[PDB]
Ligand SMILES: [Cl-]
């Protein structure tokens with residue numbers, strides 16, 4: 001597909017016309033993870049799908065200062081270049097979901113809806129309430145290609161079978177291969193927004209939907225559940241046998257629920 | 268096909284062979300509400316599907332005393348007769364999901380799994396945390412048949428369209444026509460289990476999945492979110508634009524999640 005680059009040096013794909021969806025991928029991943037996942041699903045066709053590479057990931061340059069504040073500013077700049085003041089839908093995974101929240105919180109009137117998978121809500125890892133990873137070993141797998149990533153797959157994915165390994169290689173490996181680890185490490189020294197507590201308390205005035213796994217040792221599920229009651233339009237799906245690579249563990253659930261979420265907005 | 272009756276005077280359907288699924292319906296409904304919904308939306312094929320009419324509802328006789336404790340007792344008798352000691356899966360809607368919880372608590376070693384839609388957790392209506400009901404008026408409906416039932420459809424369902432009205436007529440009205448209002452009215456005076464608090468604190472040691480709706484004014488969602496708090500195998504689906512007739516508002520979602528649940532257990 002055709003890769004574009006904003007003047008703010010954010011690499012992205014843009015496909016389709018109609019209401020924009022801005023997809024923000026997880027930490028160490030890239031737009032392959034989002035693009036390859038959502039393009040196959042029946043009802044994103046009517047939308048303009050915009051898959052960004054975060055700074056220091058994919059084909060997007062690292063940025064100085066290497067802080068979450070600068071990431072947010074750069075992504076806001078980027079979105080304006082791409083769609084201007086047109087109203088948009090947000091999708092976010094992991095740190096992508098943290099930034100999705102920050103954007104929704106700052107561009108309240110321009111945001112139509114937010115859908116998050118395994119989102120970061122507390123940036124500081126030492127503060128997070130996390131779950132316990134496990135494996136459900138469904139099938140024997142004999143890896144040929146990408147053998148060197150197999151442990152990370154096993155350490156991250158919950159449901160272990162051939163399709164999950166194929167998905168990991170297709171969606172996760174590309175980002176791992178491009179991530180700027182030094183940039184990420186520096187970012188993590190200035191990772192938490194000063195308004196993080198506001199994100200934890202805000203009652204968004206549009207659909208706000210979260211999918212979390214019981215076995216997600218990176219961001220867990222508790223803190224996300226706590227966002228739900230006070231969010232008037234807050235939805236949650238929390239599932240067993242599901243971890244941080246929730247979109248592989250529960251491929252079909254994410255497709256189903258993303259579609260159901262678009263239905264909400266369509267109404 | 269065939270309708271069955273236990274020695275305990277519980278009316279039921281039982282379809283297929285295999286691991287048993289015991290389906291419990293909501294208050295005032297009957298086993299048409301469960302049977303007609305799940306049999307078509309089915310990855311239920313490899314299971315034995317058992318759809319019970321609760322006492323005083325459907326074609327199951329009322330009981331004395333008319334208390335939830337005794338409703339539970341009757342149901343335990345019924346299950347033991349129908350499946351003995353076989354391990355089983357539980358489905359419960361609303362009052363049926365309250366009973367389901369009780370059953371799983373009582374038959375903890377036999378219960379493989381519990382799937383609940385809009386479950387009663389606190390029986391006492393005056394103590395429940397509930398949502399605000401709304402309608403999403405998608406189409407005009409000009410009812411011809413069952414016009415006298417239309418108010419309660421509007422009052423309960425959230426998503427209002429013609430399909431929702433057809434489903435309501437096929438799923439909810441048969442139970443309405445059969446319910447023993449006198450039993451139910453009496454049952455509602457001894458509605459809490461004597462052990463009710465123990466249900467609110469159990470950490471079930473098998474998958475325990477709940478679907479709830481933001482706009483459910485009957486049982487809400489908050490108490491159910493809190494159960495997921497202390498359940499290590501707790502799952503929850505909480506959706507907007509959804510009320511107490513969740514199987515009608517979110518028909519696809521229920522079949523999807525119930526299939527997923529079965530897979531979880533398999
Ligand atoms: Cl490339």
Ligand SMILES: [Cl-]
Pocket residue numbers: 453456
């Ligand atoms: Cl009485």
